[PDB]
Write a protein that binds this ligand. Sequence first.
Ligand code: FAD
Ligand code: FAD
Lengths: 674, 673
Amino acid sequence: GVTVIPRLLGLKDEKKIATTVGEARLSGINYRHPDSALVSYPVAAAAPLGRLPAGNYRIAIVGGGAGGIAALYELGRLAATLPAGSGIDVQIYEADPDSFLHDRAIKVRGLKAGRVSAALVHNGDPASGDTIYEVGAMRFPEIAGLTWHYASAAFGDAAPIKVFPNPGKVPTEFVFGNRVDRYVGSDPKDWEDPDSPTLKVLGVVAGGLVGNPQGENVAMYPIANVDPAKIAAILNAATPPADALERIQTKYWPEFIAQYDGLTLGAAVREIVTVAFEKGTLPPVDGVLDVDESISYYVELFGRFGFGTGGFKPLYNISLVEMMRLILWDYSNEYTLPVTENVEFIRNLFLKAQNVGAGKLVVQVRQERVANACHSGTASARAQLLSYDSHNAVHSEAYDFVILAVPHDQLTPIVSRSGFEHAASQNLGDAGLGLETHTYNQVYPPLLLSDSSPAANARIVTAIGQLHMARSSKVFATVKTAALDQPWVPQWRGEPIKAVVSDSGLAASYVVPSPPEYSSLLASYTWEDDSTRLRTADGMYRTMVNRAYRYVKYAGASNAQPWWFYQLLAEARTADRFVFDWTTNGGFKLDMTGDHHQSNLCFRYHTHALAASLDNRFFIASDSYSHLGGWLEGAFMSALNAVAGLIVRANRGDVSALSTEARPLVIGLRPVVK
Amino acid sequence: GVTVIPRLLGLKDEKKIATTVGEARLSGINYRHPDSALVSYPVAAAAPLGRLPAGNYRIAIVGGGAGGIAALYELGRLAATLPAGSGIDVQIYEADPDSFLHDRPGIKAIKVRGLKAGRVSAALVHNGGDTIYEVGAMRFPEIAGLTWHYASAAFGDAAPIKVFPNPGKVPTEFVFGNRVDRYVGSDPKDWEDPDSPTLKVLGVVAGGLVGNPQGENVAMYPIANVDPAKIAAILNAATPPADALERIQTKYWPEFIAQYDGLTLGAAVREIVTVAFEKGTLPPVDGVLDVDESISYYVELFGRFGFGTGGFKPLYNISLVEMMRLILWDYSNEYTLPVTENVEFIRNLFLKAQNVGAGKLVVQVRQERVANACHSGTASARAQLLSYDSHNAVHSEAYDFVILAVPHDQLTPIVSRSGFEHAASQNLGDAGLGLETHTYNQVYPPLLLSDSSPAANARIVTAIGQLHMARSSKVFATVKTAALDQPWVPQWRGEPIKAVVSDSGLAASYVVPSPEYSSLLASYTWEDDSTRLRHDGMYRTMVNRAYRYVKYAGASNAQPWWFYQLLAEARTADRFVFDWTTNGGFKLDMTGDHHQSNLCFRYHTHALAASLDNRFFIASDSYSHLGGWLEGAFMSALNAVAGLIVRANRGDVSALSTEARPLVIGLRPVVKV
Ligand SMILES: Cc1cc2nc3c(=O)[nH]c(=O)nc-3n(C[C@H](O)[C@H](O)[C@H](O)COP(=O)(O)OP(=O)(O)OC[C@H]3O[C@@H](n4cnc5c(N)ncnc54)[C@H](O)[C@@H]3O)c2cc1C
Ligand SMILES: Cc1cc2nc3c(=O)[nH]c(=O)nc-3n(C[C@H](O)[C@H](O)[C@H](O)COP(=O)(O)OP(=O)(O)OC[C@H]3O[C@@H](n4cnc5c(N)ncnc54)[C@H](O)[C@@H]3O)c2cc1C
């Protein structure tokens, strides 16, 4: 997802760096997000979420990504508490033929858990395996409590982790227009030019967006009349005051949303810069630029710099609300897991789910694509799924409960083609693909919010269908580690520059750890519009290298030469150059202005379980239905919601079936039903 | 581009429909855009833009799209005014092997389909001799004065034109969530349900964005404290007070930008709906939805409906300023040209350019890709272009002036890789592709705004590189025309329904004018709508989205949508997917983008600074305030040639015609003079 570190500190000499799963798990155990400010999800997840009545349940999970697998794990924790004679049967549907779930020696590489997967690229060298480049989930914030919670389930607290060397955490070169900086962190003493305008605009914009944890409030967009930095401290507290979290949940965060959800991040940056320029805090850029040109230069300069770990420019259209969520979720470091491939995290969680079930959870995998979900009739197994196998044969199955653990663009066709009210019958399936249909009687929509309002039912489906997928592309290569020591590679702070943030088209480029003779280079990580500007792997790689072929003037040398980084990219080994272009080939929800109302409806959907007679058997579980798209943390939160709702539904609306700690997952939100 | 028709009228019985090029040309001849409010570009273009000193000029145009070819035409008009012994030689670079420029334009009998003029082209689909589907420009607003001006040059005023049957102008089915409507236009008498909430939100949002031209002001975002409709009438007037135009240009429009360029269209819609809902001007959706769900339902309902010609939802991130430009450029109809393929417009303009040159313009075409531009050396011709031919051989050539007629993502590598100040020597070219470079000495950037401020030079380059390209995809099929008269195709206002606007994934679908067979634009999607189906085969995915149960008001049992069968029945051999992601975009400004696009729009004013001696101009819809319309490409071309004239006269604006002068001096200059 989007790395947002307001007050960037260099890694060198930074203290309190976590070295195990357990150490990271502790850092975010208390953090509560502002849309769910009554509950720490890691605390909710510390014990089984609640209790089910005695019975033999049949549940489906559609999707084997982080969402579906965390939901499975929570169902295992529940299963274990059932009495003798009782248990849960789960059918997990996963259409992806390369899913870890369908893997039947040596460990098979390159398996997927949805958007957690690595590309396996031939390198030539027979003494090594294939080169591995992670194309989805890569690194995990210290504050990601629920993620580290599940990592402990998967690997144990003792398992070692390594720090991720982001841009700005290590010596970095930044290039925007005519401006060049070399830097680490945000202390002027660690900038090659301590008087840099980049450092000046960083201070102004971080000050205006985040403000200060102590003393006077200096931020432009307060929450509860104070700086966001002060609110973040409350949300992260082990033991905040009576009613403080309630008031954030019901008053002050909704008031911030009401005021600022129609304001983009780029618009907010410009408002801050304009005030600082008028105040004289930001000086004219030089003796030539007019007022608007100066302000615009600073806005764009900030745009490419961000907070120092890569630019926010391509994210300028996101709502200030969405940016503010990330600002509140404050951290200094991200870490990698002790795995060869990150799919191992989700696979280990799947295996652990079965373990914690204590024999009361039985799982069966189906290599089938779900085409339709609906309710049929009013009896006990009223949740229907219509699916197709690898031979395109149709299958229909009925369940007590279903968790739809697929992101929004994949969920749409499953939930939107059965209308919005009761129907005497429907012939469902993929008729346009020429596939067999199946007739269902007394059909109700799957995402059933009302027995009397088709508009209510339409709202959830139309909301899902209009969420925004943020897109990104990555270009990977492998370079001799010694290349970083060529005489033409500059050094800063006693180290070769290994990270580059630039307006060249590459956006962000850096050496990535090996979870050595060779080093992995993320030659380009581009977001949104930056991912389509340049529109054989080596051929495509050369087009990117050609963008780096630019003359760069440095304050040192009187004659500009081709950028050194061009020469570094050209040192990349030829065999294992790899382009992950989303438009030829990974997207996650990131909210635009006005999108809160759609994403938050999804977030709260599981509260339908409070309405007993509605008897809706479908829950949703994905980072698409969270307020942290682009992070496993969001997928995991949504799965925790889904299973908390399922428990309440199983108990006919009785919230006392949830644990004391889990209860606010449902009752701490505005319900979606009367 | 984006069709924006606030007060949509059905085509049936509509009066004042233009029937020739000339009639359309006269309709939009006076309109002035708010960022150039002192000048009607068609009026400026009525005569040659100015005069050049005697000489034999060597000019390059990079790009043979609408921008480059309009620029060529204006250079022809200029050339004809030169004295005996004087002239203009133009080298036109066009890298596209499928360009009309490389297929013997005006020296061909067989009539080859599928040739391109940049983002104007049609796909040729073999059907069993072929089927043509426009994938770029094909319909022109009545108010597009400069477009119709050049259509006149290309075809004559007498050339016939045909009205384009947009969704909403003809009987249309609309589906959003649980809501279905069958309608034509905005008059509730032509709606199947005149009490539709869609009609209610239409009125409220069109009211709040556009307001009322005569009488009481009802808009939420005023310009000069009045409704935008009132400002539109001033900008379109034949002879409004000069001082009124000046105050729009210098005060009222800039103040609108200062206030609202940080507000997206979607945000503005929600503000309007929230106020109306709170006041009770919008009624309850039903007895169940709470206040925020109701407001949200209405915002999203409006999002899918737009003003009646397709949804604005996928454009909700655009700046309100950008939307407002389209609201001010008010019209009721768009028209098609008397062509088989729209490339014929640009080809005809190219041939006319040579004609109007009166023999004083000579034009040569290079099938070469330009990789770099710069100023270098000490000769009179200091504008350098570095290019590669089809054998990847490097070529360098110097010119007196250059017009860079390519959109912003294509311009970036040409202007951004040589730094931002004087350099002693540089090896320019595509070194990363393994191609040969060429050494230039005493090098200055091509887009030279300052001899002392690298920041000023960086601003124009960085601005170009951060413009937003709006994306779209189209899926076309051919159906038997008689299918449309069958019982299973619904009728409204005496006509089969031939247009559908929906949240199905297809977004907008309609019959397009080409008979036994009809062309169906099965799906036209913008921005996020163009990627929702990402996860003849692709055509089937779309038919599958249309396989959805639709409940209509009444006693009828819900059945699969009728439109499924129309799409299912399309001839197989003719289905065509034009998916931008596997296969043209245009500039559409986000919030804050004005400061970047307007710098590009004003760039040609550098010609006012005599000593600067910058020989490069830019010409594309990317450097206009009407991205996605030929009107914008043409406006930028007019800017480029006006600036070129001023530069060729060492800053002397009196070399421009009286009517063209404001093209340069009506804008805030980009240089100190
Ligand atoms: C490029 C990018 C960068 C990222 N960076 C980070 C990061 O820094 N840190 C971090 O923690 N996370 C990161 N992530 C975010 C993380 O990858 C996601 O939050 C998470 O993997 C999403 O899990 P999910 O269960 O919501 O959905 P998915 O991973 O999309 O899983 C959905 C599954 O359902 C299956 N499926 C879909 N439709 C059907 C159907 N109709 N029938 C049955 N099966 C179906 C799919 O095949 C898939 O396996 C990144 C992801 C991407 C896109
Ligand atoms: C999908 C879509 C819908 C549209 N709808 C309409 C409409 O409704 N009505 C209307 O009026 N207009 C419409 N247009 C808008 C119209 O197409 C454009 O405004 C116009 O065609 C753009 O012209 P241009 O000269 O700016 O650029 P382009 O058409 O992009 O031309 C640039 C030319 O330069 C060439 N070139 C690029 N790089 C180089 C290089 N380095 N070396 C040399 N040659 C190079 C290209 O090959 C190209 O031929 C539509 C376009 C598209 C995208």
